[PDB]
Amino acid sequence: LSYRIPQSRTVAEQVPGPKSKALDERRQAAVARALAPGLPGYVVDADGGILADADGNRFIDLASGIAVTTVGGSNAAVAKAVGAAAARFTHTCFMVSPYETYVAMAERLNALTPGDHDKKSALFNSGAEAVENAVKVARAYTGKGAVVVFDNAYHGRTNLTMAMTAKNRPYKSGFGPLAADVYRAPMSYPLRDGLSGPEAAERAISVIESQVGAENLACVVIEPIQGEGGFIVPAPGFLAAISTWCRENDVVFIADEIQSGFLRTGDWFASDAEGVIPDVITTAKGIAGGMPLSAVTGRAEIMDAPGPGALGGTYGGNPVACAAALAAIEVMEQADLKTRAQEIETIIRDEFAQLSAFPEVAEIRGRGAMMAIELIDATGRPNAALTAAVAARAKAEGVLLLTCGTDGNVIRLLPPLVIAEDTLRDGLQVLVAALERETA
Amino acid sequence: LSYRIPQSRTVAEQVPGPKSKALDERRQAAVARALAPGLPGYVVDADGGILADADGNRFIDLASGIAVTTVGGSNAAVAKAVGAAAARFTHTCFMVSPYETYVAMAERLNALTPGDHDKKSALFNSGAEAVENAVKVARAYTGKGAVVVFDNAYHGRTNLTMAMTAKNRPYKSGFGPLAADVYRAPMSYPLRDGLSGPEAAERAISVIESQVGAENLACVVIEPIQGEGGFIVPAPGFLAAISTWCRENDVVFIADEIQSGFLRTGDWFASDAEGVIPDVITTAKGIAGGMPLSAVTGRAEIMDAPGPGALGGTYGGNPVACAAALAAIEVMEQADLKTRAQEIETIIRDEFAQLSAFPEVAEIRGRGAMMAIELIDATGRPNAALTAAVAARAKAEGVLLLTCGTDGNVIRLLPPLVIAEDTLRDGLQVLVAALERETA
Amino acid sequence: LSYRIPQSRTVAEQVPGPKSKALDERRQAAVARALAPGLPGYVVDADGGILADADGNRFIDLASGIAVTTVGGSNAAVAKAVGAAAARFTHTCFMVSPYETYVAMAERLNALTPGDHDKKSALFNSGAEAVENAVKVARAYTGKGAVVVFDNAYHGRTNLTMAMTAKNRPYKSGFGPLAADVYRAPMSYPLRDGLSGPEAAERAISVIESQVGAENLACVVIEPIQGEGGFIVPAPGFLAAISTWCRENDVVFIADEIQSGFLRTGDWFASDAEGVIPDVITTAKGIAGGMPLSAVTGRAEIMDAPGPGALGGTYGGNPVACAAALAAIEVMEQADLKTRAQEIETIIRDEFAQLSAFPEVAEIRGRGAMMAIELIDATGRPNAALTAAVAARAKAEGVLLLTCGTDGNVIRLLPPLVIAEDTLRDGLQVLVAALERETA
Amino acid sequence: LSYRIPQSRTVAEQVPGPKSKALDERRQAAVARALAPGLPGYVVDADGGILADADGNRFIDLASGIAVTTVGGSNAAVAKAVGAAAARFTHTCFMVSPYETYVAMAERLNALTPGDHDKKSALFNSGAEAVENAVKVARAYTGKGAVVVFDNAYHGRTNLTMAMTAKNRPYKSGFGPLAADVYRAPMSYPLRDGLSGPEAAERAISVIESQVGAENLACVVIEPIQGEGGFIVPAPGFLAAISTWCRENDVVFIADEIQSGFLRTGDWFASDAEGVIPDVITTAKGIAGGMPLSAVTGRAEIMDAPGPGALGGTYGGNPVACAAALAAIEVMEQADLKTRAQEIETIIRDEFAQLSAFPEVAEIRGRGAMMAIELIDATGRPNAALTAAVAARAKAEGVLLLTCGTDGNVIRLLPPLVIAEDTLRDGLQVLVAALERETA
Ligand SMILES: Cc1ncc(COP(=O)(O)O)c(CNCCCC(=O)O)c1O
Ligand SMILES: Cc1ncc(COP(=O)(O)O)c(CNCCCC(=O)O)c1O
Ligand SMILES: Cc1ncc(COP(=O)(O)O)c(CNCCCC(=O)O)c1O
Ligand SMILES: Cc1ncc(COP(=O)(O)O)c(CNCCCC(=O)O)c1O
């Protein structure tokens, strides 16, 4: 791999620097206080494994803007395709005047998603819009209303995706009333419930059948790895068992692969590790090299249930974002990012080999470049305090680490798949020393 | 020459051509059937007043991708900003890692929107997300639940924005159950109701007070000109009276300026035309020269009600889109597109001089580059059939014009503000001869 | 007719009397403050046309406990049935252990309700429970979700019946969120809209088709005379046209006859006056001579759509209340209360011959023993102050008169059908003298 | 005690007898299919522990009309009170014309319910109406929206109370969409979860804090013993801890004592067995000796939050039902039915000595005259088939047994507290012989 900016960490004695401090004051004056960014620097370049700020700091990027910049934040093929497309046209609204890159991205998605059955796609802008439209096609197809979601789920910040999201603070509180006919089932969380995949599936199926009923249920929606919920990997056989139940009970099984999709996990989709074939898949984030695109891909007969003009949105499938995605997907093949994702896991597990020694480390989990540590206290309760402290410390040392978890006690690793081995190991070494410092 | 592509209409004997025909069969196999595009040609350039298709046809663009490409479909300042931003970084997620263009776009919105009170902004991707977030800050600020919307309203295709949208077909049907605590009031539709502004407002307030109650009501949401509902302009005084009632009753007044904003009506915001000062204003479409961007701008105290992390979305305020928006807004100022919008209204009214001679034309309405004609039968009832036939005849002659209206009987005009006078006149002459041909 | 207590009005200069004042002190200590009884006397007897209080006052009853004690408040046949049933059994729960009086009352309702098609009934306690169960059998039967109700409607105080009710204060305010998928259509209110029945029906059907869609709609629910809304009588042909549209569009037409049913209007059901044949009819109030009973009666195939145990309620079709209802219906037949209700309408219109002295009287409307006066001010606006003054003056003079109306400007007349002519004329002469005095 | 009808079991070889068969044919013609009664006889008398049918059969009553006829089916003091009251007046509507027996029942409830704090009451007809009004006062008082309920909960058959009810079949299926802002927490079901009281409460509270948030929550509603769900008695300490959490979090703790109240469990309120003092308590069933009455009793400040007219219902607090209830409550005191309940428990545990052995019997549980057996197969899975067969076998031998359970595998015992000991022992011996016969 060749890089445009230096791939080495460096932070000044005073962070933020003066230009970033100035931009932070403008942000306080102009921007809703809810938008409280974590990085103590204003980005001017994102390339390989580095975020470069307005003051010359270079932060190691283990965030990829939350699993979005899988191909890098400024991949040359993506930037070239974006520039070229904008010079031809930025927008026509596909429903009004169509264009080839929309159709080409639908074909790409139909080809890359699990299963050999006939599939169709529809393109939107945000992950929340993709989840909303996945619910729309399932309701239109089944003629049934209810939506089943899981403990620890996250599906977005719209009224319905807030209902589907498990965590009240800060995603839901004060924004209700929320969309009705949404029902929640227990998740396979093996660290906490010690259940096998099939046992966890029996428990979930028992709730859904007792409390909801197949005859009322359009869809069951699950993240094959739960993201904001804490990189929760279900026990083997769990997802398969839920998919089988949905097929037997004429319920649409929807995999939300917005975070887990496009090689993040070392497979094209996380569904592939257990060879689960979802009826419908939502994608976003890594799809378009950072440009705003999302998609719903599914069985042709499900995707065709809505009538003419029944799905839409002005910007959906923006031609510049579609050109970006076509360029990014080809990069993923050409640069063998699937093998890089697999190598990223090996390196993380290697650098975390000493973490067993720490009574605060409950579990190391995930797949490919979607890995996490869960942190606990002396009595085994979630350790959100320590999680926050370790992330703030890493940050002061020039490493951007994200937290998540139902209980706020999970450090996640989301490096871009183009990060240099040298840069990744430096990043993971800073994390382990910050964990040493905060527990010692 | 002022334009990249020729600014003259040309359609072949057979449209679609074989390239567009081959693309339509690819669309049929790969894309959900709900997305049935209107233009019989696949777009390769959008520049000035023209859409060029893959077969060499040139259509006059009186759509601007539904009031999005105000500054033209491939504006050179927009294309430059987009290419340059993508080469530095496509995305960081503002909530994680901040950047200047997000802050500058909030500053620009705060400055350009009505009122000299303290304002803050939050950026998202689609118009529906912007409306969803306007409701969220109104609910967070008031501690009240209910939402009031109007007859003929359109607000988007999410679960809450469908509830907020008036027309069932095709936007809402089969997608329920929809978010509750949404109440609908009668609209000032002077052609149909014959009411003064103050009278229509008294009627709307009487329904709100009787059925909803201020003590239950977070917000009143209205388009200052109703777009999809038929370019409905409320009677003079209506918006002020509703604005006054909200202030007197602790209810947030929200102007949906997604279609009517950014000089579309010959003012910066349609609200300006009666110096109404909304508490909160939603923007999208024309804001970013075709890139996916939307915004909520309001009174600082309303925008800051949500807590840290309580508003968000991965892509919102994309740096490539914010770069495009800063460029488009500079073009609006520097090319004085405000005057171009006023001249466009003059030209539209001038070419429609002889529409007096048509009993089928009920009304010519709107302002600037947001103009419409409502078509009726011999009884004075809506004539959707004539509306569709005129649109299809115009398309066959190489002019793209859109239709809308609760009853499907409104031809709307949404030229880009950079359209050449000769191109606009040719487009309008084709529309007038299509109406002549189709009414005999 | 034979009476148990004296049938002449006699009310003290000072009311409440001492025994009623002491009871009111106990009420204030023990009963939720929302229950604020109007009559300045504690009832010890209700017989014929009279409410006798603890202090010996005899008030003329033009309320019949809100259209409930149609056969009188202590009919000797009803009283004897109630005594006799309770000494056999008070209760078994019909769906556990059945009993003949439940079945006999289902047969009575099947027979007395409009239409010659096969009908079945289910019995509950309150009118709200009967409206809830009418919606349940329509949803079960159609497999569709939405519910259509009208301006000025009143259907009860449960979560769903509050949503169905139009007026926020005091019935709905503060008790949300309320059941979703409830849509409101405009009412035929001839005094205000000037529309023919067919014109009002076209207007309502336009809203329902535009905003709801038959494909989403289980049922249309309307009171054939709107009770709490102000004894609104739709223009001739309105109910027929709505019933026709429901038949043509596979939507269940539900008549709410809770107030209007059981000879209140001089027909068995107010639907009879225009030969309308509802799919489903809700009854309560006058059905059981004051005992708590309600009923859903409908097409056998609609009533049978719910499966075994899918409808219920512990008390529903209480054997004591059914014994009361069979006795009350036998009185209605034996005492020819149908003719009495027509004579009561004639006596009311006779005693109101001079309301032409009053520009405050906008309309006299209703049928049988369901008659009303709407009051306006000198500018033609609703006159709730005069309405409340007249009712307060009447009570003080010893006449119980209820008020109602969306705008609180309607005096209603709901005398029991067993009222003596001399008692009714005294009552009406008091009302007319109260109107002369409050306007004079 | 003194019985009006012979207290010995007698059934013919063939049931139903012929009068009951003629009545069942009339029911099938006239009554909605959902209301398929279980007893193979039409009831003519209910007295002591006997249901006498139209054909001379005498069934032992282990049902009491689902926990309603606590004082017997035709108690002489209740029957006399009902006859005397009906002969004076059946109904006035308390909120129109008040009467002493409504006030006297509010005083009785204020005095009998847990705690010494100031209380007020409101009277309705059904248990579901009481739960609906408990939610209404909790929302009015808190100004918060959400309702927490538990797994296995049963609260009624209205839109909101169905939402609050856990089990889909047959109570909820096909009747949505249901009222929103209802959240479910896991229940203390020690047999199934092997959890302690304290653990179970922490588990429930973790869900409520994480998914709902106190700042959004009006009320927590729980049955102190879960009736339809399977007579689930929570582990000791569970209810206390939920009550403690609600007081610390400004959330209203509503105890649903509709089935468990008025001495059924051998305390006045099942809450008493743990010194829990509910903020609000809902009662019905046993309150009025089989007459239709329900009540909401709570803290005066909570009960007074709704404004004048904001709670209501035509029939609520019917004077005949209040007379019945005042007579029933005097019988409970004067005949020491509290001791009769404690004695019935001893008799049930005695006759069950040669049961709890049977491997198919998982648990005997409950208190007083609220006792149940849960049945399993060889695997330990729920045994609904055996449950149905035992109950069918018992009925044919002249004993009325109800079943219940989330999984349909619970035989419940609800004798009237006036049953003779020899009648109860005969009934329980039939149950054991039926279980012996049906376990092949
Ligand atoms: C699985 C899964 N589904 C859906 C979504 C929603 O995608 P949008 O593009 O953020 O709307 C996400 C977005 N996750 C990032 C959350 C960050 C924040 O906003 O707090 C996801 O992870
Ligand atoms: C006023 C107003 N508010 C909100 C929206 C929603 O904007 P999104 O960007 O399409 O979500 C719009 C979108 N305009 C109609 C789009 C046409 C279609 O999709 O069928 C609007 O006009
Ligand atoms: C048409 C119609 N449908 C339904 C209902 C509901 O009947 P319930 O028996 O009061 O529940 C009514 C009750 N009308 C009197 C309510 C008075 C009050 O409570 O303030 C009605 O009139
Ligand atoms: C705890 C609890 N709360 C509330 C209720 C509801 O009381 P209503 O009087 O039946 O409405 C009940 C009614 N229980 C019997 C239901 C039988 C059936 O109808 O299937 C209860 O047990």
Side-chain angles (χ1 to χ4, degrees), chain D residues 190-253:
Chain D
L191 165 66
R192 293 264 184 105
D193 59 34
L195 282 188
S196 101
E199 294 177 66
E202 190 164 340
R203 180 192 173 192
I205 292 155
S206 298
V207 171
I208 293 169
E209 277 179 347
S210 174
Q211 299 189 4
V212 187
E215 72 275 10
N216 305 308
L217 185 54
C219 51
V220 176
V221 185
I222 195 172
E223 297 156 85
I225 306 184
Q226 287 183 319
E228 301 310 298
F231 282 18
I232 305 173
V233 186
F238 180 72
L239 289 170
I242 303 302
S243 170
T244 305
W245 182 89
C246 292
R247 173 174 63 253
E248 297 199 71
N249 285 280
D250 305 302
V251 175
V252 175
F253 181 83

Side-chain angles (χ1 to χ4, degrees), chain B residues 55-419:
Chain B
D55 292 297
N57 306 123
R58 294 192 307 262
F59 295 91
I60 299 196
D61 181 355
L62 310 178
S64 62
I66 323 181
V68 169
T69 52
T70 298
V71 297
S74 53
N75 182 269
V78 172
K80 164 149 58 159
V82 162
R88 306 299 293 278
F89 60 100
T90 51
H91 165 93
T92 68
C93 189
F94 186 78
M95 319 184 68
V96 181
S97 300
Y99 43 92
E100 185 152 5
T101 50
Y102 187 116
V103 174
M105 269 305 304
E107 280 168 353
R108 213 71 152 92
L109 283 162
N110 296 340
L112 285 165
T113 53
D116 308 316
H117 60 276
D118 288 343
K119 282 171 273 174
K120 280 174 194 194
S121 288
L123 308 185
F124 307 99
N125 312 102
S126 64
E129 288 188 310
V131 176
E132 289 256 5
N133 280 276
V135 169
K136 282 169 75 167
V137 302
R139 283 183 167 170
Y141 177 69
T142 69
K144 295 185 277 163
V147 172
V148 163
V149 285
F150 289 83
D151 284 346
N152 320 286
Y154 183 93
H155 296 297
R157 292 173 175 273
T158 63
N159 181 294
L160 170 61
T161 56
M162 287 190 288
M164 294 173 63
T165 290
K167 192 173 185 178
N168 168 59
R169 188 188 192 187
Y171 310 123
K172 301 183 79 150
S173 185
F175 299 131
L178 299 181
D181 266 55
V182 175
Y183 291 85
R184 199 170 302 281
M187 177 57 179
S188 170
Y189 191 169
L191 173 68
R192 302 275 187 81
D193 59 42
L195 297 177
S196 79
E199 286 176 333
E202 265 190 62
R203 181 188 45 167
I205 292 159
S206 185
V207 169
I208 292 164
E209 289 198 339
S210 177
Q211 294 188 10
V212 189
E215 68 280 16
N216 304 300
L217 183 59
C219 58
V220 173
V221 185
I222 191 163
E223 301 156 79
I225 305 174
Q226 288 182 319
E228 300 310 294
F231 281 20
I232 305 170
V233 184
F238 177 79
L239 288 178
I242 302 305
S243 175
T244 298
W245 180 89
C246 288
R247 176 184 52 259
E248 295 174 341
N249 286 276
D250 295 345
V251 173
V252 180
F253 182 63
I254 307 181
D256 186 355
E257 292 245 22
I258 284 158
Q259 196 162 161
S260 60
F262 284 97
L263 292 185
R264 176 51 61 178
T265 64
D267 296 296
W268 277 93
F269 297 98
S271 287
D272 297 338
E274 291 177 286
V276 166
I277 298 176
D279 296 322
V280 176
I281 176 162
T282 56
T283 50
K285 294 182 159 154
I287 189 170
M291 300 304 291
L293 187 61
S294 70
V296 183
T297 304
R299 304 187 153 270
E301 55 276 15
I302 300 173
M303 299 301 294
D304 291 337
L311 303 177
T314 301
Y315 287 134
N318 176 93
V320 183
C322 292
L326 287 162
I329 291 165
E330 180 160 35
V331 166
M332 286 174 188
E333 290 173 326
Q334 285 292 110
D336 186 18
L337 290 186
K338 182 202 172 78
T339 303
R340 298 306 150 243
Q342 283 154 6
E343 298 165 358
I344 281 165
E345 180 174 352
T346 296
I347 291 155
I348 289 174
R349 284 183 178 289
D350 178 55
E351 293 293 340
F352 284 175
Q354 74 272 58
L355 283 204
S356 313
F358 291 83
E360 299 91 354
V361 174
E363 187 167 56
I364 294 167
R365 65 172 176 256
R367 298 192 288 289
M370 186 171 186
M371 295 294 286
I373 79 183
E374 177 162 356
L375 294 187
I376 54 170
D377 63 20
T379 323
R381 303 176 303 163
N383 200 342
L386 174 54
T387 303
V390 170
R393 181 61 71 212
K395 209 165 59 187
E397 298 307 318
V399 178
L400 180 61
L401 62 72
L402 297 183
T403 71
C404 63
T406 302
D407 302 308
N409 65 320
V410 180
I411 303 193
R412 51 165 157 181
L413 298 172
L414 285 172
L417 291 191
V418 295
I419 187 165

Side-chain angles (χ1 to χ4, degrees), chain A residues 52-315:
Chain A
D53 80 4
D55 296 289
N57 302 299
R58 296 197 296 274
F59 291 88
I60 295 178
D61 182 351
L62 303 185
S64 60
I66 324 181
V68 172
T69 48
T70 300
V71 295
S74 57
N75 171 275
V78 169
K80 176 176 201 316
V82 164
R88 300 294 301 272
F89 53 108
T90 55
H91 169 94
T92 64
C93 184
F94 184 83
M95 277 184 299
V96 175
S97 303
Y99 40 99
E100 180 156 350
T101 51
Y102 192 108
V103 175
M105 263 309 297
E107 290 164 339
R108 263 310 211 154
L109 281 163
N110 295 341
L112 282 170
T113 51
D116 293 335
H117 62 277
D118 285 358
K119 291 170 266 177
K120 295 179 172 178
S121 291
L123 310 183
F124 305 93
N125 314 105
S126 71
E129 286 186 321
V131 171
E132 289 250 11
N133 276 279
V135 172
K136 289 169 71 163
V137 297
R139 293 182 166 170
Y141 179 66
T142 62
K144 293 181 285 168
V147 175
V148 159
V149 287
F150 289 85
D151 282 335
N152 318 287
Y154 181 91
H155 298 297
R157 293 184 180 263
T158 67
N159 181 284
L160 171 63
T161 56
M162 276 187 290
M164 292 170 66
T165 292
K167 195 166 181 183
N168 166 60
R169 287 280 189 201
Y171 309 122
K172 303 177 65 150
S173 193
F175 296 134
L178 306 183
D181 223 11
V182 176
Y183 291 86
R184 202 168 306 274
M187 178 49 180
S188 168
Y189 194 170
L191 171 71
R192 286 197 196 170
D193 59 42
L195 295 185
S196 72
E199 280 174 313
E202 192 182 321
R203 177 176 53 160
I205 287 161
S206 284
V207 170
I208 294 164
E209 290 183 332
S210 184
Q211 294 189 0
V212 188
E215 76 272 12
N216 305 301
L217 184 59
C219 59
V220 171
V221 187
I222 189 162
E223 307 157 71
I225 302 181
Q226 286 178 322
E228 304 308 295
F231 284 20
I232 303 171
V233 188
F238 177 74
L239 289 177
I242 302 298
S243 172
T244 288
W245 182 86
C246 288
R247 175 178 64 259
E248 295 172 338
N249 290 277
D250 300 325
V251 166
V252 172
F253 182 75
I254 306 178
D256 179 357
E257 293 247 24
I258 284 164
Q259 200 164 155
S260 70
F262 285 93
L263 296 173
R264 177 51 55 175
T265 69
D267 293 309
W268 273 97
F269 298 95
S271 295
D272 298 337
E274 313 102 329
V276 166
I277 308 162
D279 301 323
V280 175
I281 305 193
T282 57
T283 57
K285 294 191 162 153
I287 194 176
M291 298 306 284
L293 185 65
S294 69
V296 177
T297 297
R299 301 197 152 264
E301 56 278 12
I302 302 174
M303 299 300 295
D304 287 339
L311 309 174
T314 300
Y315 291 136

Side-chain angles (χ1 to χ4, degrees), chain C residues 346-370:
Chain C
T346 306
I347 291 165
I348 292 172
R349 293 183 177 278
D350 185 53
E351 296 289 347
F352 292 174
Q354 290 316 75
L355 284 197
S356 295
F358 308 113
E360 292 86 1
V361 177
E363 222 193 340
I364 291 157
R365 64 173 177 253
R367 288 206 291 289
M370 187 174 187

